[PDB]
């Protein structure tokens, strides 16, 4: 025998075997994993070489965005390093529902109203979208009470906000009992019964501090985030023992 011999007569299939593996590790590591890093990179305290050149999108209604967006993150004073170890959870400085941190965090989305193909506002109440109805057979929730987590009635449903692009209800509007104000709630947080709307995510008094819209008959992308995030905050923060174990 010979030093450096292997027991392999080369054939075409063996060649194509090595080439296939090469194509796979190339596409994954050098294309797919580069595309994966367009949002949230470069990484921060308290990577570089394998980042692609920022991407530019031409938006439908004029303008361009470049990703990643350079808008800074604003709820950084609202959390504090309990510990010197980077792995340690951060601690809220105030009321995290109101400060909008952890699961109550909104994203720094744009203060623009999402639009239909033809330039109208996409998400609007049925008092505005008078050509839209509820389908024959389903609950019209207008008039019905909203029962919160504590069993207390928190308000009455005044309207539904429809997505005009997708023909899909996305929010209920209720008048809050004991205020001169309206609140939106995402339908995903709503159990729609025949005689009531059940909301398990927050208590009755907590509807007081649902984020407020700048405008009555339209909503911005950042506002949609702010509203949706508030109720998700409730899952962990509506009572003290919701952020504790089931130990």
């Amino acid at each position: 025998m010979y030093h450096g011999a292997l027991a392999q007569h080369l054939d075409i299939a063996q060649l194509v075997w090595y080439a296939q593996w090469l194509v796979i590790w190339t596409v994954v590591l050098l294309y797919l994993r580069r595309e994966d890093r367009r949002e949230g990179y470069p990484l921060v305290e308290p990577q570089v070489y394998e980042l692609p050149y920022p991407k530019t999108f031409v938006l439908p209604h004029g303008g361009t965005v470049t990703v990643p967006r350079r808008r800074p993150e604003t709820r950084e004073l609202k959390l504090a390093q309990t510990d010197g170890f980077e792995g340690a959870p951060l601690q809220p400085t105030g009321n995290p529902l109101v400060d909008a941190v952890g699961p109550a965090s909104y994203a720094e989305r744009a203060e623009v109203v999402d639009a239909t193909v033809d330039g109208k506002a996409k998400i609007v109440p049925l008092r505005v979208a008078t050509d839209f109805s509820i389908a024959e057979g389903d609950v019209d929730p207008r008039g019905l009470p909203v029962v919160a987590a504590d069993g207390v009635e928190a308000g009455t449903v005044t309207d539904l906000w429809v997505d005009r692009s997708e023909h899909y209800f996305r929010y209920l509007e209720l008048s809050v009992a004991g205020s001169a104000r309206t609140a939106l709630i995402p339908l995903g947080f709503c159990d729609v019964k025949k005689d009531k709307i059940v909301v398990t995510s927050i208590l009755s008094e907590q509807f007081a501090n649902v984020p407020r819209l700048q405008s009555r008959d339209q909503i911005t992308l950042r506002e949609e985030d702010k509203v949706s995030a508030y109720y998700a905050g409730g899952l962990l923060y509506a009572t003290p023992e919701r952020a504790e174990s089931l130990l």
Partner: protein
């Protein structure tokens, strides 16, 4: 070591067990109680594979095969080298999988999102249990389970099919295969559609939800919609194994003949026989 948007989400809470004893991160990884137990069960399992491998012919990890016991051992315990390793490793495997599933629950709760991912992950854990636990119980021996080797496990699937002459005529299998095919197609169409709208090419403008619906109404006369395609995709993928499981369970305990002959219920109806 943080994504640019990540810090505001790194709060205490959402654990099921241990309070904040395990409520922390190591690099990008959340720990929790189930992170600790996952690492336990993984460390046991890999140790046993190493111990078993060292007692066997070769160290080539493609030729390594830890096999279940002979049929004669039934549901009893077997000597380590004659399928005891296989039994220990199956327990560690289930330990790790169940830990991983419950860890995803703790992560879901911290972010205030639905539990949909860990629920979806229960489907493959179930199918593993059908192959390694439920079907062997019903036949009365651990020896009916599939072996832990990269190539050896294909030889088991192969012989198992041919124990029923032609596995392709298995009605649970026909259902399972149909879901695997339509799922791979659906993921291509969904992936392709999203890329087509965000990347029309040539510095042309990004398109809309209205363009998505119009595209499929034109091509097949119906568009299921943006939310619904995600619910459908979880449905088609999940049903690969939910329908598959009845085909596997039935083979031995509920049917001993070839699968083609099963269609006798249709072929041999008296009025057209």
């Amino acid at each position: 070591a943080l994504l640019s948007f990540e810090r505001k989400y790194r709060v205490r809470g959402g654990t099921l067990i241990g309070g904040d004893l395990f409520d922390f991160w190591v690099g990008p990884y959340f720990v929790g109680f189930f992170g600790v137990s996952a690492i336990f069960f993984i460390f046991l399992g890999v140790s046993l594979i190493g111990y078993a491998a060292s007692q066997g012919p070769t160290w080539d990890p493609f030729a390594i095969s830890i096999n279940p016991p002979d049929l004669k051992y039934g549901l009893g315990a077997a000597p380590l080298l004659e399928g005891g390793f296989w039994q220990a490793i199956t327990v560690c495997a289930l330990g790790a999988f169940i830990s991983w599933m419950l860890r995803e629950v703790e992560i879901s709760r911290k972010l205030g999102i639905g539990w949909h991912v860990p629920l979806a992950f229960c489907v493959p854990i179930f199918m593993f249990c059908v192959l390694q636990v439920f079907r062997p119980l019903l036949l009365g021996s651990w020896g009916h389970a599939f072996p832990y080797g990269i190539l050896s496990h294909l030889d088991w699937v192969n012989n198992f099919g041919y124990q029923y002459l032609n596995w392709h005529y298995n009605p649970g299998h026909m259902s399972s295969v149909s879901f695997l095919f339509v799922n791979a197609m659906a993921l291509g169409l969904h992936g392709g559609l999203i890329l087509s709208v965000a990347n029309p090419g040539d510095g042309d403008k990004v398109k809309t939800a209205e363009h998505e619906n119009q595209y499929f109404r034109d091509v097949v006369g119906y568009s299921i919609g943006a939310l619904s395609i995600h619910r459908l995709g979880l449905f088609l993928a999940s049903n690969i194994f939910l329908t598959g499981a009845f085909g596997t369970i039935a083979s031995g305990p509920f049917w001993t003949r070839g699968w083609p002959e099963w269609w006798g219920w249709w072929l041999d109806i008296p009025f057209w026989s």
